[PDB]
From a paper:
Here, an alternative approach is described for the purification of antibodies utilizing an engineered binding protein based on the archaebacterial [name] scaffold in combination with light‐controlled α‐CD affinity chromatography (Excitography). Affitins offer certain benefits as antibody mimetics due to their small size and robust fold, comprising a single polypeptide chain of just 66 amino acids, which forms five β‐strands and a C‐terminal α‐helix, while lacking disulfide bridges and posttranslational modifications. Starting from a published affitin molecule, a monomeric protein version (C3A24) was engineered by substituting the unpaired thiol side chain Cys24 within the binding site by Ala, and, unexpectedly, its binding activity towards the human [name] Fc region was even improved (K D = 76 nM). X‐ray analysis of the cocrystallized C3A24 with a recombinant human Fc fragment revealed a 2:1 stoichiometry, with a binding site at the junction between the CH2 and CH3 domains.
In the present crystal structure, the homodimeric Fc fragment appeared tightly associated with two molecules of the optimized affitin C3A24, which both bind to the linker region connecting its CH2 and CH3 domains. The symmetry‐related interface of each affitin molecule is formed by three β‐strands (β3, β4, and β5), consistent with the positional randomization strategy that led to the selection of [name]‐C3 —and also in agreement with some previously published or crystallized affitins directed against PulD, CelD, or lysozyme as well as the green fluorescent protein, GFP. Surprisingly, it appeared that the affitin binding site almost entirely overlaps with those of protein A, protein G, and FcRn. Overall, the interaction between the affitin and the Fc fragment is stabilized by a network of hydrogen bonds that arise from six residues in the engineered binding protein. Among those, Tyr40 makes the most significant contributions: both its backbone carbonyl oxygen and amide nitrogen form hydrogen bonds with the side chain carboxamide group of Asn315 in recFc, while its phenolic hydroxyl group forms a hydrogen bond with the main chain amide group of His435. On the other hand, the C‐terminal residues of C3A24 are involved in dense contacts with recFc. In the present case, however, Lys65 of C3A24 forms two hydrogen bonds, one via its main chain carbonyl oxygen with the ε‐amino group of Lys248 in the Fc fragment and another one via its ε‐amino group with the backbone carbonyl oxygen of Asn434 there. Furthermore, it seems that the tentatively modeled residue Lys66, despite its low electron density, contributes a salt bridge via its C‐terminal carboxylate group with the ε‐amino group of Lys248 in recFc. Indeed, the small Ala side chain snugly fits between the two nearest residues in recFc, Ile253, and Ser254.
Residue numbers in the entry:
A (entry chain R), B (entry chain T), C (entry chain U), D (entry chain S): -2 to 66
E (entry chain C), F (entry chain D), G (entry chain A), H (entry chain B): 236 to 444
Write the structure that this text describes.
Amino acid sequence: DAEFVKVKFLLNGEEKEVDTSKIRDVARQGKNVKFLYNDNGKYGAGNVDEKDAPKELLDMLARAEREKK
Amino acid sequence: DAEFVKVKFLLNGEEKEVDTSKIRDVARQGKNVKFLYNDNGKYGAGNVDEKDAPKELLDMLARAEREKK
Amino acid sequence: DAEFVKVKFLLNGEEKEVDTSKIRDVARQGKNVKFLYNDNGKYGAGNVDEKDAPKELLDMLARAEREKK
Amino acid sequence: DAEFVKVKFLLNGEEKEVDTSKIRDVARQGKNVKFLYNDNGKYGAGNVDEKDAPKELLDMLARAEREKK
Amino acid sequence: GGPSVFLFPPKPKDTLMISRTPEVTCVVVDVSHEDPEVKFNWYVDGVEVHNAKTKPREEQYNSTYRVVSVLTVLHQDWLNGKEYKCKVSNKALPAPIEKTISKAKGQPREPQVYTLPPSRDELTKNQVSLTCLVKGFYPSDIAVEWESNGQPENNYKTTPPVLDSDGSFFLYSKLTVDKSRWQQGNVFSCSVMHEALHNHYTQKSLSLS
Amino acid sequence: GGPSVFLFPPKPKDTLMISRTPEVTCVVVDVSHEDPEVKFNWYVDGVEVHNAKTKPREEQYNSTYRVVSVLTVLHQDWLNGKEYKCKVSNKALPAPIEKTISKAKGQPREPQVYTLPPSRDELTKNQVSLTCLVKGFYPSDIAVEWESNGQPENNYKTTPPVLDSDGSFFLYSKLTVDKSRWQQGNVFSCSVMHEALHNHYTQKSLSLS
Amino acid sequence: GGPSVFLFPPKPKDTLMISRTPEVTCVVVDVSHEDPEVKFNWYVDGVEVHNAKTKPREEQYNSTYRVVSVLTVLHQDWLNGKEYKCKVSNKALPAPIEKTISKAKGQPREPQVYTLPPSRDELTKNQVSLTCLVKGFYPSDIAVEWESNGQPENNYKTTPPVLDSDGSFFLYSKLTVDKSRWQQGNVFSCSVMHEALHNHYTQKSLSLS
Amino acid sequence: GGPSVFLFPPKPKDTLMISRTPEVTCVVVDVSHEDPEVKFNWYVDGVEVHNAKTKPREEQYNSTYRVVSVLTVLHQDWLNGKEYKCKVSNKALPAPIEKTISKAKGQPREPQVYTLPPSRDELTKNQVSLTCLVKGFYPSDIAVEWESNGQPENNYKTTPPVLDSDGSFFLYSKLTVDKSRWQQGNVFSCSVMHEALHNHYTQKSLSLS
């Protein structure tokens, strides 16, 4: 089921993009989804409006609200 | 090292917080840990759910159940 | 045991006599030595002129002036 | 359901005596068998010449040399 | 007059342990069977409180009664030196009775706990006296118990507290034990509980060595 | 409610020393200006006695009076357990008041006097606590003083007597002294006086060793 | 010897969840009334940062104070192994104090989570011990909780991490539960959270049958 | 305060075996070459003792020394909970150092020793983890070793003791062994030594059946 969907986001105005599989944690702040990720070996954070979020990221978020707490 | 563990609790809806070192006695009532404390010269009491109780408070509680009796 | 001095005195004109060993306290009033005694189990008092006092009673008196005071 | 055995020894010149069942460890030093014991809640130590040592104490000693090491 | 009224403070151990319930107790004696109506009103610094409980009337030989109210209190209220009033209102007494009780005012002071062994001279006896001195503490409210080998030793008496020359308190406690036990070499412990101790609790031990 | 009457025993040291005068004292309180005259009648096993004296009136709060009679007694009378009644007769009271006082009933029992030195832990302080245990005595009436080098030491406190489990009494006395003095190596003595002692008097000493 | 400074890492669960706020805490102890004012400067790889906060003074037994700064940090900063310096500046100290803290250096390593059921011998008791082994992980920063039926089980204790012979860490966690519950056949789960786990999170379950 | 002082209790196995010598050890570090005289005074419940030994100076690269005193003790002294003080007397610091160490107070409690086999999931590895739980013991001082076929197995680590909810202690010990050996069907044993065990010693075994 090798998923590998991408999440596009803005970092310092620059339009970055990271794989779903590199995302370690997701969290919601209204219609804003934050996410911590691990790209190759370095850790970074990223925002996205929910409208601009792939549904897999929102699936991840739900799963995490259940699991992590 | 030797920490300053603080215990957060609710008093008349106000969210108070007291150091462990000011706590004179602890006791458990179900899931609920009570504790008497002495804050700079005034005595007060406080509750906490066991889930919300730090290790050190629970250590104190155990020690007291052994010792005081 | 090893004292048995008797002190003779007047009680209601009647001439009583009590053992030294039954005397609990002695006191001097001029040439008059008073003494409280415990005869078998009942307490009594008695006078004697110093001339009529055995030396042991006067020894007791000195000891008591030192001790009791 | 059976017998017991006491070990006689000298403590500060006083002749103490302790049951084998209160003995926690035994050890040999030459002709001299030492033993640590626990008498109703206080711990004490005791010597005995091997000649003056009961069979059961020497049995204990052997068992310990095997087991503890 | 007629009846008579007493007001007792909570047990010292109950104000120091959050596990326990301290109480102030009002006792009224010599209440008339002709009108045995007793009314209790409880005040905590003026403020009326309606959590008290009155144990039912209880009669003696004289068919005169004795009624007792029980006001459970908060540890910290007592200890912060709040005042507990009881207005007792009978018929027999011309005018209701007002009594107030409270912890002793003054900066709290930590007890010094020292155990003392038996006198040499006492050893000629069958029982000997294990002694504990508690000194320099304020206020006087205190608890003191003895134990050995993780079990209560109950053959002791403690003196009342005594006002010392510096305005602190001292008392002595005396546990009596068969000279056999002292002489074997067992260990005895005096537990002291006071507001001015860390953990409201300390302990000191004593043995023939 | 009217007046009230109290009746106090002689000083323990005054019944034991023929050199001194023991006295029983009657205190009457809450005597008002409405009827201020009080009358005293003293009885020694029924028999009326006319050697009492009444100290002049004194006022309290309430502008009530307080009147005090003082009956000098015989050592041996008190000690043989005679009874001292005082009939107090104010107008205010429907009937005169009769109170009786006397030495405590029971076989006398000799005090055991043991001195205890300071705890090792106490030595870290400036002052140290020299202790005296008095045990197993009856009745409770007793005197206790301290001295050193044949001179009074006054910095002591003695507990009340305490009822022991065998129905005898014990107390402790505590003299406080600068650790300097204890450590030099001086000698301190506790004098105890009781009816059940030979000479009504005994003494025990204490020094650093 | 003037004050003293200590520096504590964020809570392990706070660096792994973007929903939560990790913080580094500087604790400064033995600040006296003689000079009670302490200054804080925070550096993240040299760069000064002005988002710290200093909780008010707190005084202790020694009449010394203790002051605490709280620097909220970024998850990814901490985890990428940035360095947090705190320059503490009292006058008392000849020169201000510099302390530095940071995540433990070394290749991260994934925890292996294995649950172990009670010993057969333990079944004779009323409570039984559900065990979880976490092994071969780096760095030591880790979180561990228990749950059943989608609800927290809170009656557990976890050991400190322990350095293994290969330079990784292990710990054990122990949940205690009435043998009734274990024997019915309920399911218990140990949740482990670590940087080296997929999703910063894993879980392992355990049940009677 | 230039130097620094540490005080270590005896090894748990040395207080439990009369065959061995327990010792309390005082370690003093950062002693000045300029002021190198260190004085040690040892006290056993106050009482000075003159059997200590001070190992000769040991100097580092730092040209500071480290000096170590060794007070051999009696098993029963330690175990009956006597107190060991060391007065360290530094020229450099104008204030001598006083440290005291002693066994933990409280009713002793017997360890429950249960061995746990590897998790099924762990069997996919080359090495497997044989586990031993020691639970409900007091005080924490304890020894724990492993062996097989009458020979020491040294590839284990034990956790520190951990305070349990009932105020006892628990730890886990972990022996690691090639899955080959576990699977053949050899037997392994965990030896536990504690004051509260009969013979100060017990043993529990573990094998693939």
